[PDB]
């Protein structure tokens, strides 16, 4: 239908309490991916991507009863963050990673640290010095790419930081850890493991390049978590000096990544027709009318909106298949 016909449904969805978004995330179990895509396009269109992401992130933080597991599970929140970073952080990812990865793709020099995988005669020591050289150059490129990360994403990171400080006030470690979990575990380290998904690379890595990518991503992830490899990871121990000496640089990077206090937001005016995505979301409400009606029967602050939602869903279904 014409975009205007969805304007009632849309003002419900964009409300600050996000009760419709919460109900939708509930009824959509597996198909988080689809819901995330539609919601992000809608909220992006309206310049309300921060309202969506910041609110969902704070909700996850509030529900977490163990700070060590924060954001580890696959949620709508984490899925939205991944899609959002994918859409906006490409220049950061290229600035951070492209040159290092293209060198690795072209390199004939092994970083193999497992002696048993040496098979036909090379030297782990030589392989370690090389890996440590790769790591130094890379980590410098990542840290100095800080300013390239878009302001809005940095603002969203700053909001994560204020949120975990409030939740765990005597834990002085969370404000860097919560940022690491997005920019490394869910952005940089996946990109090193599969450089194709940010189109850094076009062809599958050679075996030596493939191994180096794995060992580089492993090393970076441990530095990102500010932890040395232990005795259960015996061959990775040679990277421990690198991690130890670089832990403070990692902390400085993660801390300052969120140092955008105010919402930037400026993009002027993006109003292409949105009714296509509004129709997609309406289909979801219709597909789950049964569930949402069950959720609407619960008293509480969400109840007003949800009864309103089912109403709107039925009316748009009237206007749809009406005789004309």
UniProtKB/Swiss-Prot annotation:
In placental villi, detected only in the trophoblast layer (cytotrophoblast and syncytiotrophoblast). Not detected in stromal, endothelial or Hofbauer cells (at protein level). The record marks 72 as: Arginine finger. It comes from the Eukaryota. It is found in: Cytoplasm. The N-terminus is blocked. The modification Phosphoserine is found at residue 114. Inhibitory regulator of the Ras-cyclic AMP pathway. Stimulates the GTPase of normal but not oncogenic Ras p21; this stimulation may be further increased in the presence of NCK1. Interacts with SQSTM1. Interacts with SPSB1; the interaction does not promote degradation. Interacts with CAV2 (tyrosine phosphorylated form). Directly interacts with NCK1. Interacts with PDGFRB (tyrosine phosphorylated). Interacts (via SH2 domain) with the 'Tyr-9' phosphorylated form of PDPK1. Interacts with tyrosine-phosphorylated EPHB4. It is linked to Mutations in the SH2 domain of RASA seem to be oncogenic and cause basal cell carcinomas. This is Ras GTPase-activating protein 1. It comes from Homo sapiens (Human).
